[PDB]
Design a protein around this nucleic acid. Structure first.
Lengths: 129, 65, 258, 188, 286, 169
RNA sequence: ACGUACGACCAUACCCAGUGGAAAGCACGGCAUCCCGUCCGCUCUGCCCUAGUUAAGCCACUGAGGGCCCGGUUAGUAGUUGGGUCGGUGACGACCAGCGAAUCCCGGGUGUUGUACGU
RNA sequence: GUCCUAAGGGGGGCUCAUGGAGAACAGAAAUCUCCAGUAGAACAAAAGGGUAAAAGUCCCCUUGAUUUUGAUUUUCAGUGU
């Protein structure tokens, strides 16, 4: 049974612009990802209501954050026509950014975990182009 | 318009409900969707009339926020 | 009242439409036994939030003169008083005094049985929280006399004592203690005062099965001397005032649900 | 175990005071055994508490809020004496009787506000009180003085205390009238 | 003239015993327990936070007429069962002790035959209500960065509904009316201690060794404190009732009764006191 | 039990007082004198009552004082004893175990004279204690110092004589 | 039984002094980077629990002088209401009742206790 | 005849009158220190038990000088928002 949330648990500042996306980690509620218009994503520890990581590198608003289904990756899609992948346990970008979209990347969708093949995951990015 | 709060020229003009420039009126703000800090719905606020309605044929006001 | 704090105190002491909860002053005479003091302590512990305590010896015999009682009530804004006393004729006496407009409305003597008296500390149970009003049970045939008598006045006084603060709502977790007064119509009848904690068990239905466990104090009373109210003062005290939130009903005028 | 008690006469209730009245007699055993006396009294208390709990859980509105599960209680119906008499209207003052006779209406709260617009300074100022308009000019750098008034002025006094003198006279007159009204009302 | 005479001693009125001991503010206690916005006859809980030289004491207290009742209790020396062995009075230990008390309260209630009237009268549209308590700091100063608010933060993160504001946490700036969550996270995980260890090891090595002698002896580096406290929080949330056995001597209660009665001094009897009085009278006569 | 290390006498504090009795420039210059004598901002004291004989007024700032603790207090008291040639009177020691003295000029402490400031004297008062004075000064569980832990006049005279090699006459 | 934290009665617990205190705990203590606050890190606040010490706090016991608290006695007595009921025209003198003291004196005592965690 | 970011409210820290013993001028009476101090000070009232980690006294914040709504109470309304 899930009980109704009735009160504020935490209010954590740190984003300098409006928050545009948010998503919990699939493992537990201890980790939250947000993506904002200050060109950053942020990982939050929700047990103590504290910042955990700041993910920088985008030059446009981070329109979308999306955890991988196994929880080992975080994908961000931004207004700078790019998609980036991050390690949520260290706050570091995995390899380089994804290039090839002409306009704003609006949405992300991970391939389901049971369909992964060739020793890799696949990620769909839907853009304005 | 909910009421007329203060016509600056005369309390008699306030009592008569005269809509001139600078008049404070009470407006129904249900359309604006204003929620207070305790979660209650504000549906009455104050606005100041910013035009000359007898010359313009309409009432223009600005919310006092 | 030049001071704002003194003005606030005067406004608190002023007569009101909805009255403040009554305050009880606990005081003793020049001679007062240890059993009587223990009984007074148990009653004060039941009524801590709306009581004041005197600690000196007062040369007052209430059924002879109550001028000092009226002065104390006016000074402390206390409308209920518990007076402890002891004598050869009356070995352990609690005089319940109820006042109206800082004058004596009525008085009743309770004679305490020393042998059957048990304090709250003589029962090894979890006690009542501070400020929690209990539920009440009055049992027996002594409380339905057609003419007002000592047992009727005792029931009224004990209701005014254990009344607490009125409220339109109560939490279901605040129904854990009950005060039971038992007295039968008849050589003198015995007014017995007991306090119980309430436990609920599953019974297979919606309503729970209540169980009781003794809380204390254990008290046996014999009713003694009585001071009855003046009829005009009684009418003044029993008048009821209407709040502004009670609408005076007009003919053919009502309010719909909107 | 049952949750309903059966007695020859039903209980009465006052749920505003959480009070249950048991009309049935308490057949206390005529024994010297404190123990049998005590479970007899505890049984009577058990029935009283059970019927009170049943009445409270069945006849009152139950609402589950963030504070908890609450029972809507009726107002108390057991007649209890007051501690002070019901408040009465004060005796009419001289002004109040005069205003009722002459049809003088009370002023509105906007009308009696301690605020006015001074056009010479173009500012909002208090009519009375601290830095009020009734003490205007008492702190001004320069005050014009009439020669006849300064000739008729007593020695030692200044023109800077005239408004305080007038205010003290007005306050004294108002206080005297208030004391007269208080004495008459106390006589009544 | 003598101020302390018989009239002074007769007229003297003593304070309360705990006021004389300087332990209880009865002015604050009266408003803490006998004052309520609603008159719903509901029980009230207070989180009592107290500090000694070497320990932090947190209790969950209700007030009855014969004395207070401890619903649950957590001590900072019980963090040794979770892996914290040094700094048992600091801010991070305060946070961990508050978290431990919160998890113990929730596990005792089962929020992690006899039944209550809430269950008996529960409505269909009724959700679970959080456990509610109010902070009780006693005589400590409620300045910004005090450890009482660290205990409160730990309990509120553990799940107790405690009404509070955030202007007394470390990192709060009065001018901007904002809270620095970086400084708050640092104080939660003990990073102020870590930066003190680094600064002392850089500047005053002898003072560093003297102050943190147990840290170096147990090989607790300053860069491992955050991981140690995070692991402690995870283990507290996993097992809030882990048993801890100290290195103190262990005997039974009756053995400790015998041990204390071996050193207790008995009250003198009436016959012995009369014999001593007679001996004193004989010595005065001689 | 007198050889316990917790009974060792030490200087609790040293208060330097200047009572000029007049408000304004004289009080300001005395406050500056106390300031660079000690190393901290001084305290200005107001008169309790109005005395027409002394020419003082109620709530009028007439005196100035500094409380100094630690080795700074020890060295300032050393300078004062150097001025007074390490000699004190038996009446200078109080029954509670404190002492004090006074000087008429402040140049001989080691302060270079400045013509715009002028001449000022002062009162030194040294208050002594043992470890455990926190018992009477802390907020929670404030208590009284025991009688065996209290300091006597003979004890502080002996401590002064042993410590500074001074003379008490 | 001892210790600590919250307490309940609020001197049988207060005022003054002396002696002792296993264990653990309290405490005195040590250090001012960070949070915080002072004329002064005295207090308050933060960091160590290592090292010294039971000297003081605290606890127990003892001792005077006070004070305070129980019980008896005073005593159902003073005092006060009743022609109350007998005389006295009446006031009043007894008697009958109802209420109802205190001083003096004697004896005893100088803290009991709840919950939780420990020694 | 003068002076004041008014009074009030909330929070926090502190303890007063007085006496004893001490400190250059300073001497009954100027300021500082310690000890003892049931309030014997202050502030309100007219206690026969007002208030001491405060109701006293100093800091911080508000000072916005009489808010909004009401089908309800009482009175009024030829100008009945």
């Amino acid at each position: 049974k899930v009980h109704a949330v009735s009160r504020l648990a935490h209010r954590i500042p740190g984003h300098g612009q409006p928050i545009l996306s948010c998503q919990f980690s699939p493992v537990s509620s201890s980790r939250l990802a947000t993506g904002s218009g200050d060109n950053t994503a942020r990982i939050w520890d929700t047990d103590s209501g504290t910042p955990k990581f700041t993910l920088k590198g985008h030059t446009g608003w981070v329109l979308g954050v999306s955890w991988s289904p196994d929880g080992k990756y975080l994908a961000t899609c931004s207004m700078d026509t790019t998609v980036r992948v991050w390690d949520p346990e260290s706050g570091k970008q995995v390899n380089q950014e994804f290039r090839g979209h002409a306009k704003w990347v609006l949405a992300l969708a991970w391939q389901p975990y049971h369909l992964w093949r060739d020793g890799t995951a696949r990620l769909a990015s839907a853009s304005k182009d | 318009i909910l009421s007329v709060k203060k016509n600056p020229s005369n309390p008699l003009y306030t009592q008569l409900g005269v809509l001139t420039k600078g008049t404070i009126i009470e407006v129904n703000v249900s359309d604006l969707g204003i929620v207070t800090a305790s979660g209650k719905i504000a549906w009455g606020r104050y606005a100041q009339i910013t035009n000359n309605p007898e010359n313009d044929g309409c009432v223009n006001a600005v919310l006092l926020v | 009242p030049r001071n704002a704090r003194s003005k606030r105190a005067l406004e608190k002491r002023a007569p009101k439409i909805v009255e403040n909860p009554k305050t009880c002053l606990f005081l003793r005479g020049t001679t007062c036994s240890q059993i009587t003091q223990d009984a007074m302590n148990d009653l004060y512990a039941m009524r801590q939030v709306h009581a004041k305590r005197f600690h000196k010896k007062n040369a007052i015999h209430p059924f002879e003169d109550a001028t000092s009682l009226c002065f104390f009530s006016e000074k402390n804004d206390c409308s209920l008083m518990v007076f402890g006393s002891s004598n050869k004729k009356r070995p352990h006496t609690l005089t319940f005094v109820r006042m109206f407009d800082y004058k004596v409305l009525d008085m009743l003597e309770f004679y305490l049985d020393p042998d059957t008296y048990r304090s709250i500390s003589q029962f090894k149970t979890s006690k009542i929280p501070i400020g929690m009003r209990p539920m009440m049970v009055f049992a027996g045939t002594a409380f339905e006399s057609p003419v007002p008598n000592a047992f009727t006045m005792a029931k009224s006084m004990l209701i005014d004592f254990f009344r607490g603060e009125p409220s339109d709502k109560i939490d279901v977790e605040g129904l854990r203690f009950v005060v039971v007064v038992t007295a039968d119509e008849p050589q003198k009848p015995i007014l017995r005062l007991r306090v119980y904690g309430i436990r609920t068990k599953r019974s297979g239905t919606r309503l729970p099965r209540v169980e009781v466990e003794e809380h204390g104090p254990r008290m046996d009373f014999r009713l003694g001397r009585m001071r009855e109210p003046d009829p005009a003062m009684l009418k003044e005290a029993m008048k009821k005032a209407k709040t502004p939130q009670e609408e005076r009903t007009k003919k053919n005028i009502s309010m719909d649900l909107l | 175990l049952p949750v309903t008690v059966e007695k020859p006469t039903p209980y009465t209730f006052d749920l505003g005071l959480l009070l249950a009245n048991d009309p049935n007699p308490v057949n206390v055993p005529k024994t010297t055994d404190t123990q049998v006396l005590e479970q007899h009294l505890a049984s009577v208390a058990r029935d009283g508490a059970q019927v009170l709990i049943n009445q409270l859980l069945t006849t009152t509105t139950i609402t589950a809020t963030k504070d908890g599960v609450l029972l809507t209680l009726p107002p108390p119906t057991t007649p209890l004496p007051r501690e002070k008499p019901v408040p009465q209207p004060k005796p009419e003052t001289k002004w109040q009787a005069f205003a009722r006779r002459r049809g003088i209406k009370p002023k509105t709260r906007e009308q009696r506000r301690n605020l006015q617009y001074n056009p010479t300074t173009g500012q909002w100022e208090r009519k009375w009180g601290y830095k009020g308009a009734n003490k205007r000019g008492e702190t001004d750098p320069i005050i014009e003085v009439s020669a006849a008034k300064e000739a008729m002025r007593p020695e030692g006094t200044s023109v800077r205390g005239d408004k305080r003198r007038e205010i003290r006279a007005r306050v004294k007159k108002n206080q005297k009238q208030m004391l007269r009204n208080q004495r008459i009302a106390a006589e009544k | 003239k003598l101020v302390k005479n018989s009239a002074y001693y007769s007229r003297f009125q003593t304070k309360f015993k705990r006021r004389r001991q300087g332990k209880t503010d009865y002015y604050a206690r009266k408003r803490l327990i006998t004052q309520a916005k609603n008159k719903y006859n509901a029980p009230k809980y207070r989180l009592v936070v107290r500090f000694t030289n070497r320990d932090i004491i947190t209790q969950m207290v209700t007030s009855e007429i014969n004395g207070d009742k401890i619903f649950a209790a957590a001590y900072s020396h019980e963090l040794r069962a979770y892996g914290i062995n040094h700094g048992l009075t600091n801010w991070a230990a305060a946070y961990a002790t508050g978290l431990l008390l919160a998890r113990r309260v929730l596990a005792k209630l089962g929020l992690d035959g006899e039944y209550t009237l809430t269950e008996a009268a529960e409505t269909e549209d009724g959700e679970r209500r959080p456990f509610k308590a109010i902070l009780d700091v006693g005589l400590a100063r409620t300045s910004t960065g005090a450890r009482v608010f660290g205990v409160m933060k730990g309990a509120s993160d553990g799940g107790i509904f405690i009404p509070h504001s955030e202007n007394r946490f470390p990192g709060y700036d009065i001018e901007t009316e904002e809270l620095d969550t970086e400084v708050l996270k640092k104080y939660i995980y003990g990073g102020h201690v870590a930066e003190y260890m680094e600064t002392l090891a850089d500047d005053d090595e002898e003072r560093y060794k003297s102050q943190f002698v147990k840290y170096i002896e147990d090989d607790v580096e300053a860069d491992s404190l955050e991981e140690l406290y995070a692991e402690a929080h995870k283990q507290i949330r996993a097992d809030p009732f882990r048993k801890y056995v100290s290195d103190a001597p262990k005997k039974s209660k009756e053995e400790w009764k015998a041990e204390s009665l071996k050193y207790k001094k008995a009250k003198l009897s009436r016959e012995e006191r009369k014999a001593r009085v007679e001996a004193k009278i004989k010595q005065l006569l001689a | 039990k007198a050889q316990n290390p917790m009974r060792e006498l030490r200087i609790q504090k040293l208060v330097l007082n200047i009572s000029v009795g007049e408000s304004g420039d004289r009080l300001t210059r005395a406050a500056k004198v106390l300031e660079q004598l000690s190393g901290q901002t001084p305290v200005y004291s107001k008169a309790r009552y109005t005395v027409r004989q002394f020419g003082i007024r109620r709530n009028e700032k007439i005196a100035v004082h500094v409380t100094v603790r630690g080795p700074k207090a020890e060295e300032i008291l050393e300078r004062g004893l150097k001025v007074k040639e390490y000699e004190l009177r038996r009446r200078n020691f109080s029954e509670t175990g404190n002492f004090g003295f006074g000087i008429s000029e402040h140049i001989d402490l080691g302060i270079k004279y400045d013509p715009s400031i002028g001449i000022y004297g002062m009162d030194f008062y040294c208050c002594m204690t043992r470890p455990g004075e926190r018992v009477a000064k802390r907020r929670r569980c404030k208590s009284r110092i025991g009688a065996s832990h209290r300091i006597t006049r003979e004890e502080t005279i002996r401590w002064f004589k042993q410590r500074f090699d001074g003379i008490v006459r």
